[model samples]
Target: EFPYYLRSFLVVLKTVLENEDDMLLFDEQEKGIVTKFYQLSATGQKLYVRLFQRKLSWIKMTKLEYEEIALDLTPVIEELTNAGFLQTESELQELSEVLELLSAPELKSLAKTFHLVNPNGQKQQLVDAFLKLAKQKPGIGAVILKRAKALAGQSVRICKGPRAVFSRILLLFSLTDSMEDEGLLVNLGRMEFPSYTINRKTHIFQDRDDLIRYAAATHMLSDISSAMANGNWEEAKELAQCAKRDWNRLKNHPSLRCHEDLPLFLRCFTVGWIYTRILSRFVEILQRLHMYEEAVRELESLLSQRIYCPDSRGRWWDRLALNLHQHLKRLEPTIKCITEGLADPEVRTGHRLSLYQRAVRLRESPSCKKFKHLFQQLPEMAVQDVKHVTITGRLCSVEELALAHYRRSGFDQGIHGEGSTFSTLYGLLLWDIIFMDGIPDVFRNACQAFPLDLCTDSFFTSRRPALEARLQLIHDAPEESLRAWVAATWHEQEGRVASLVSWDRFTSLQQAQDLVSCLGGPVLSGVCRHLAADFRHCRGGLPALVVWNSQSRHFKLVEVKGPNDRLSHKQMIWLAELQKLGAEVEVCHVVAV
Candidate 1:
């Protein structure tokens, strides 16, 4: 019977707790007892005893009788009154009434869960309760508000599992009134509500700082995107400049203590991107402004930074380097045009040629050496092909020589009347060998009567070897005798033999010596010309040997005899003589091919 009664009493107690009016007990016997009873004073205690007896013990008891008979009732009331019972009772009763009117148990549960107080409770409790309530109830705006209020002095730590959802909710709440109002909920000390405060002192703020730093570092990336979208050259240049300045500032910022401490790959990406973009834009602007020298300088800077450093290798960096290289290459024609269009003829000829030479050097692809050779020959070709000459005679004068060459017989074939075909033949042969792949059909038809070689193998193997041997001999000749030897050879071989030979055929000793003498003439002439020009143009004298090749062991000995034949004493004397002429002398044993 006791167990049954306890269960029944518990059920009734729960029901009464659920209802505001049921939980309240009133009595007329005590005048000022209303507040005391509500406050759970001596009278309230007697009222509870009576209710308990009737509900659980099946004992007949009235509220008035209980109040009169309960021992120590008056003393309890006096103590409760001293403890501010009346005010506390009034506040609790008001809260209960408000809860009753709310009409949603789930909402009440959520409020209780969050504990609308100066600081939020344990995170798990808040999270679990909020989740439960959200699942159970609709129109949870009030519940959310109360929960936020309870978090007044606390911080939210969003873990990975809930980060995305939490961020979305935070964003939504931030924009909505329910969450925004939570910010206004001040605590007792007039501090901001914890839920809405963005205090940097918290761990979350530390994480946020890291994020902000990365964003600041990569801010320039956005500028590139903007420039690409608009396709505006001026705007792109301005953006690149601005980005460079910003990056320079970021690189030296106090916050970044060590490069290792930074996100290395990310930093590399950001800085590399901005730098390449700046280079590209600078080149473009210089080309547009007819500043070819400046453009070439900018291009070299980009290529040198991006391409040559193997240690700085990465796929993204490599791609960026290649892209910038290609862009600069595509702009070469524009560079040439602007350079040729200069107003001052000397500036146009001298400065423009210098600019072109530099551009070719930078633009030469590493995959082939032929490009470099072609680049080296461009100056002489420009001089000889007066038809294509934009500035001629003196760099200050412009006299088109296209008709002059056209009117002269054999001019296209480079056969002058004085039998001195040195300059013309050298220019035409070099142009074909380097730039035209040794197969200039038009020149071939014009020089059909001459014993000119048209085959690539024949030209490269025969003529190229002779030319190389000649260059070697010139390089080996004494400084004093080089000029006289070259002039004599030039006079002898001027029109006697075609500027054609089998590069692979074994060179006769006499022919090799002759080729060397011929090659020496140019070297000697160049040195004298340089010295003379220096005297005329500047105060300093020229260096003794302007461009002599360093002696290497590989090219020292001439294998004049057949493979089985031993070297003669005369050959040894010749080797010694060559060494005295500045060639590195060494013995190389020959094997039969």
Candidate 2:
């Protein structure tokens, strides 16, 4: 067939010939394949009608010499292939070579060839493929994430999902799971003010009063901590306000200007960023110290302004972080609402904070149009609900969270290029046993099993009752099986995800084993609930990360929020639910000093 494909378009360049009537004969089979052989060129006229029997229509030539017209078709063929028209052997070979180089139109056309795509080839699956490939080879990832909006603009509707979904998912993943340690993003309060700098020489005579302010600030922070210890939150709140003022005086130093060189940039940025972290640390202390209103008010005051942290002072600080202030700005209204409501009370219990926490979250969300699209696809794309997933993950990197202890906040341990990072000093704690596989099936589903309600749409709604009854079986089982099954599943998962964990970071296998031994008990509960959550809600109650430490080990689940960021109502529900299960979770709001 290919030979004929070539022959049908071929021409004999040279020939000694004479005019002939019907020179070539074809077999019955060959005759069916060829027709309308040739025509006279003098005028538009058919030389003959011989459909049943094919004939070679040759033109008169010189008695001893002749020429046949030929074509160099390489350019035309190259054009088609480059335009994403894959046909001949030459086309498919160069396909992947130009994959990353393909225009959106070319990629869009190529997308249709797969059955995974609809007839129009406009499904989000194409977007998913591009990103999945990008994760696999960050080196050749020519697809600039910023260009997705262009791809979205070029989208044609597909029957399976909305056009918006593709762009939205890409954007959502871009913002959250995509740019990890986005936690580096902080609050911007005041810009006119000069921030503290690690480089003291420029103004060592710096601020002229840095030491004065610092002594006062240090005194205030310590004194407040002492006052809280003494159980005087109201007094501590006053001290915090004073600390905040001194903190402000340093930032507002009249002599301070946007000055930087090599050491200077690093010094100012790091110091300024660290200060922002210290402020959040203080607020956390306040929250823990029994002064909710003051913490909330202080947060409100900080967020209300263009957070004046010398911009480049943080690791997470960048043009990306710059955009956060606008989103954080959305929270003032909600914050004010929650502030007024929560000002009324609490003991060191965190119960009142928890209650107010819900209000904050309900009023706020990460609030990105892209996030909605990205989250909508979770049910279809999720491997399963896990206790904690990484900010940056990939095809091979998507290890399940929650089986291990909560460890490492975004700060000191915040680079997530590999999709998952074990935050412990060595990162191998109990990893061998935790990610191990082939544990008993009974143990696997022991803690976390779910009904269809947690899965897809109403199509599975009827299956809910059946799922409920099965869950009841686990509930009815003896506690021994549940715990036994948990160990089995734990070991099984350990085998499966061992390689995925940042095992190389661990100091020793001894430490890893001990770390594994520490919190497998409560971890089982976190894992169980994570699995069940898919049935109840799609995007509602998940936190950005899990942070942890200790001999027995204390895992603090953290919800990272920037100034404009609000506490999520559903996230609140999950927070409360986890608390009910005895999980230590905290909401950390990020703001600049």
Candidate 3:
């Protein structure tokens, strides 16, 4: 039997090779290069496949021992080295790479050789000191590097195989397969998935250029994230600046002009969406650098028509307003920004309410009186306190307390379902529509449980008629038909991984029916409509607890809040939607007994 990872790798490789749809994404040369693995001897193939599973680029030859592999790896290593798959230590150019191959004790020896004062921290510290010493004293640095390389011994870096190409191939398999990169290596035998159609024509990248852009943007964004994580302000700033420059170039390119007509949700799937992310991070890093003016400028550029991230405009506006008020200290500009943000058509309910709350705080001054009307219309939330509780010698959370209170009030059938309850309902109701085949670029591979367009508005717009038809069927059909639908779906698709539904042992056909029947058609369909239109934004902010009077077939959705908790703007929006649809909704707070 082959190793699990090797088997998985081969499975994906074979799948890609055999299928014309997957093969078209790669060039003839890439296919030829990847297929070279078969040309190696059995042990060489095993060694090379094992190397693919490792994250580290440079590996010491001594570390190549595996219980499954041979007692001595020397012959296999030499075979691979001669085959051009592994490069020896002599070929390594980067001093950093050489340094990585050395152990902590070996590194310490180098520090001692160089007579470093208190080079007594982690391996990273030692490496840093050595690099610094080299920069200051080049001659000593040369000798230290040579010694370090010798200590590292027969270290080989994987110089061959379409590493990046394979990564891109895996990225394609990732979303399409509905499994993570590592997860793709082994099959979960206990899991069972629903039968659905896979659109063979669908692919994430239309051609090689799309893949290149994706790879480039991915690398740039990852570097920016890493820079931020290290708390390197200067490094973050430079990368952000470079990211901004590249984003501008992407905006001005001739080929990019065509997608502007696409809706914002669909446009988000494009490279421009990544630009939004990069630009947002860029501004964040700039602000941390105390460059408020530059930060404000970038935020303004994002808020303007130059970027298509309308969903985040509220965030940009809030930041812009804050910088103007607190940092720039311009009262009129700040108030103006808040007003504009409040009026922004694309601003989501959560961010919109935040702008209003901010305006209320800002309008406390004399200058903001004229704009008080816009800020004054705040969302009204009903709050009531339930008894604080301890269960099993542990303090219960607000949702748990509210759940107990509901049980005391005769709502015995209840759960802290929040978004999951409705998402499950949506998933159960629209299973066919969600997995409908033949939609271009929707299903990137055969194994996906979710469509690529699921999060986009196009998910609804493109398939509006079908969705509307399904919603109508749910509305007009008897509750038993809904129950029947769920049971059938659960029978086929039970434990398969789905993004929306909770597939835990607790969820059952009976419970799903109780939820849907009590929720009623109008409310259920209304929630689905909102979810279908903007699933990305609407997925959150559902009520914390859903309890039903099983006999009366009535449901009450309670949003539980702790003593310090307040209703979020998203919660407000969801509550309003529920209330308008004649569903019982409230915010329940908890207090000490």
Candidate 4:
């Protein structure tokens, strides 16, 4: 077990093989025969690795030397051969010559036919066995994967629609990212079926786009879902393009097992996924073409349709609603926010704040009460500090407060250079309100340029784990915990809110509560999900909940507003960076009530 252990031996073999130089030793057979050797078995590979390390090769070993190493060459040699780590012939060329000398199905076959080695009984066993072989072997895994894919392809060709769906899903689970754990997969060969749910009314095609990208839609979706989940909209967009192209080719056949007007996309019984995704994609393309009305029709239809999901409880409906709100620009005269806050004001003069002031100038609406109540809770402390250093109601609160941040500025090292001259616990907490995408780099660069030992990174990126835990408490008890995550940390349990700042310092700000107060649990989560989609182009696009009158609850984007925030340049295509994250946003500018 000392020198002949499998993994320890594998470590040695991997190192030696990965090195460029090849070692040579004379054969222990007949006479002066010489050759190169590496082991490939439970025991034999270890033997050669040890021998190679000790200035010897298998062919140079003698009886005493072999016995001293405590290896039984009998089964070790056979396993090495069966697993293809052993080569029978020594003389070979540089690459391709070395290739044949290695091993193939034909050479491995010699082990079974001649009764040289025992083969595993099942396909999975063989798959597992070779995967083990590949642990110390490079080319071996590729061979097994190719073979698995081929086997999966064969299954696909034989099974009918739905069966083929699971078969391919099973196959992918077979040929996933690594084959090391593949043996752990359910063997497609033994997979059981309940009953075939046929959708001949749904059609599938095999076009020139054949060889690649066919299988279950779920596999493709799994990739997309992870991308969206990680908030990688750029990558998500590319994958969606592939899905669109794939959808077109798949729908081309036009031939089907008929059920009139049911819509091929709906009847696509391949999985409930293909149904929703196809429609979602159609909606996005329509919104892009500036045909908002058409996009709405599709979304409304999607919302109304009763979908049958084969996967059982996926985020299908959530994704549907996400697509619905994402196109809020369709109805809103005003769009996303101004990103100009970062680079010294190059954006159109009407800019985000300006446009928001125009479209969002609040009036007596149904929940102006909600807004007023929300406005009432605005942690009035910051307003006093922002308005005139602790006096109520003034012009441009955050502007002065934010401008106060202009360090190395002409005026203010100010009357006091202490903590009061800088940010508030309110500002710090408000800073946590970020959308899923379109995060401005200026915020980060500004922090880096102006260093803080206590604040060494984006609070969002750096201490996100802390906030995520905080949010869990919020969603954990939604209705009962109405003030779950908002401005309602009663009396710092364990001084929890203190981590963001200090419970003793900047303790509470009633008016400051207004910042996130309107952000009810449902609205906050909804925007965050939609935020996960691509919206960077809506530069100067400020979206928010405006209590559009009392009686009728209206979801409006508050379309038009601003100085030069002219939705001009056609207000056309998305503001690439604006859509990145923050608010696609607007911070309130309180006009005297």
Candidate 5:
């Protein structure tokens, strides 16, 4: 089950109102009158008089008689506005528009007792309807949203709380149709359970024992399963609401204290999971409603909270970090989309990239270094491309890239040229590697002018073995060995391999085979190392398989020299071995530099 504070508020209000006769003696009629009087009474004394008068009226009248008066008073109040008796013309116009919207047949019947216009020539009645419906008819709460949206236009954005209400109402409406279609009951016995199984030992509920909590949670889950079975969304929502409430009450129980009792690491894990579920639901609601800004706000809030206090549990923190990284990754593209839509040309090309550039430049400063540390922990692809280049994967000396870009643009030349040479070069490099399947020699040479050596270090070297191993797993025996060696060399900067080869992982051997066959090679070989005799024999039909053996001081190129030659004998043997293994092999010449 998901978190439930907001859902609880909604359900509690609805439940109280549904049973109002027993709970408050004020059915919708008395409720509507009290709301109207409360809105009209601006002064403290006037509020008391209005309350007293309603009490007196209720005391003298029978329930049926009181309901009749309430019904009769509704339209009479409406007429005062109909007769153009408003003191403020703008307020009157607003009220009329709201009435027009709510005059929908369904809303009118549901909120029949709440008059939205009054005799005082004021907008108090509109406020009265808002409060009353907020208390009695959750369905009519939709009217408050419609009116708020109409009046606020683009000026006032919906905050999280109001946005949450709007989402619940939307969900309710969706469920209503779904339930009707499936002929399901509109009660809390037909929703689906959460996808995750709760940890029994970690269960917490002061009001109920472990067994009871589990039973309640499981019961709600069964209800959800039934609703899903019948496609009954209304019943599903009600059941979901019950399950969510039970879960929250159990998780947040003050005395049960299971959350704290769990290992510190497990506590963080549980909290992080809870946070993710909450964030996911929040995002789903926002996306459904097309409320992008609020979604971003919620995402930012979740991120801030997760990182605000680092957990003492290392494993928990690690898991939290990973999950946080994934969430940010998911959020980045959406945020970029929204930001792009909102960005002015001056904002995008000017200030936005400049801000990133400034961040890069600040790397020398302690604060900037800390920021970079934060950025590094983020998911790999979270950074957006600026001027067609992604900063996320680039070297930490991004400041140099920015400056080079600016200089090449001739910003220092007293005029903006048609293009920046540096930016064009970067663009061409990206295009070549990303689209052309191999990096261009020209850009690779250009990259050499930068301090490439400064970027090569142990951290990158440690990644090479794993990359090679993965590459090896994808291809056939002989080629897999060769490609893995090539990948390793490329990672280690043994030769200028990046300029000539492209290595990508595939999900299946078939995919790797297809890709390899398209590259039109019999057997792949490193032009930089010697191999075993068996490997040498694996090169058969192709040109010489050459490897630059750095230690041997010779570019060991294998080719069919002679049948009796020791190297050729070994090569032919391996060649036959490869053929038996369903691999094509080739022989090539070695060249010394």
Candidate 6:
């Protein structure tokens, strides 16, 4: 019988192979590697895959004993070695790879065996000492092993190259840079998911070049993050600059231009998203280095060019505005930035509100008195005070105090789920639209929690007809139909991990139905509109708690505030929008008794 782990590996490999022709997806070299793996004996395939599953790049053949395989390990190791799938320590070109295989104590033991003095400091210090010792006495590794009977003839091998091939194959299947083998478990009945279509026709990478660029971009990001983690800011800055230059060249290449055959969605999603990420990282490093002017110029170039990450335009504008006012202290320039941000059509509803609020606040400053007319008129936000008492010894949060007040006043149905409460409702209502099939390149694989385009502008644009129809049904249908719709969806897709739905938040189906019933069609549709506009940015800013009366069919969306806490930009926008939907909304400020 094949080992369970080996079956999972085969499942992934076979899926990638079956999806497209090897020539179409992989170059000759990668295809040959895949072909060579299958040419091996069954035992050889099992052994190589077992080693590939290991996290360690270097492994000892002595540790290859597996009762499940029921075979000698020497022949398998020799087979893999001959096929160039495994390499011994001596075969490694980099001395660092050799040293990486040894622990601190092992290094110390090796140094003692070779009659060389080793450091008593950290691991890096010991590694440096070992490198110096190896430089002085070449072939000391083999010589020392020759002297020690216990360590002699032990085979250690590196499977890094073959592992890379497997990783890429897995990535091709997942469409995300991961090597997780969860698909096999789900397929084998070890795991279950709600019924949703996985579109095999969706092609994320059209060609080998596309795959290579995306892989390169992913590695570049990983390298930058690794450098940053090790406190190597200068190295990260250099890497970021190199990545930015490479991506810019690729993005502006003649073949990648608008006149070419490149699809607009793919261009924006793949290349544009990567370029935007690189610039964001570059800006972050520059800001950390206190290069405020350079950061400003970068943001200016990004906004002016308007070619990358259209979704992040709002944030970029706000960042530029804040940088000018906060870091550079240039009032007129900051005002100009805010003015441009608000007027830009690409800015989403939630982000536009944020910029408007910032502009309103900035206009009140004595330095920016003359720019008051550039901002919109501010509406008076409703705020109410509620006294708090601690029934338990520990002080309660404002939300908890507010919930208690509502419960006492006979509005008994509610939970403090915040964004999750609204998101769950939204997710339930639009479950069909979100996971709908036939949208190109959105649902690429089975591993995704939600559609790739759920957060993007294309999410609404691509399926506007369907989404609008769904919302219209919600708006026009009676409360019973709406309740039945959500109740059925909740039961069917319950416990499936989704982007917005929090299962624990809704304890019972009746609760979700009641909320859906109370909110009615118009209110539900309006809430859905805010989310549909920009789900990525609009998922937040909902009220703190939604308390409703079961008997009266009345509901209140209450935003709780502690004494020092104030309404956030998102909360203010959501409150205004909720009122426009004809739902009762309030800001309850909890004051000490």
Span of ten consecutive residues with least summed lDDT in model 2:
13-22
RMSD of each: 37.0, 30.0, 4.3, 23.4, 26.3, 5.3
lDDT, candidate 2, 448-531, per-residue tens: 111111222331233345434434544444545444443443444332222233434334444444333333444433433343
The sequence of per-residue lDDT tens digits that candidate 5 reaches over residues 83-107 is: 2221211232233334433323424
Who is ahead in TM-score, 4 or 6?
6
- Global fold similarity of model 4 (TM-score): 0.22
lDDT, candidate 1, 311-423, per-residue tens: 22222222232333344444434333333323223222333333444455554655434344333334431321101112123221011232232223222211111112222
Highest TM-score model number: 3
Off by over 4 Å in 5: 1-103, 109-115, 118-272, 276-358, 363-476, 479-512, 516-593
Candidate 2's clash total is: 33
Give the TM-score comparing model 5 with the true structure, all chains together: 0.22
> For residue 516, what is the lDDT in candidate 2?
37
Native-referenced Cα lDDT, model 3: 0.73
lDDT of 6 by residue, 182-288 (tens): 11233422334445666644345556766667667766777787777687888889999998889767766543453233343444435445656777777778888
* Decoy 2 TM-score against native: 0.25
Model 6 regions lying over 4 Å from their true place: 1-8, 21-23, 36-56, 59-83, 107-118, 128-160, 176-206, 226-235, 248-251, 258-265, 366-411, 445-449, 491-505, 558-567, 586-593
Model 4, residue 301: distance off in Å is: 6.8
Model 2, residue 71: distance off in Å is 20
Model 1 vs truth, CA RMSD: 37.0
Ranking by lDDT: 3, 6, 2, 1, 4, 5
Give the Cα-based TM-score of candidate 1 against the true structure: 0.19
Residue-level lDDT for 537 in candidate 4: 21
Looking at model 3, which ten-residue stretch has the lowest summed lDDT? 176-185
- TM-score per prediction, in order, is 0.19, 0.25, 0.85, 0.22, 0.22, 0.79
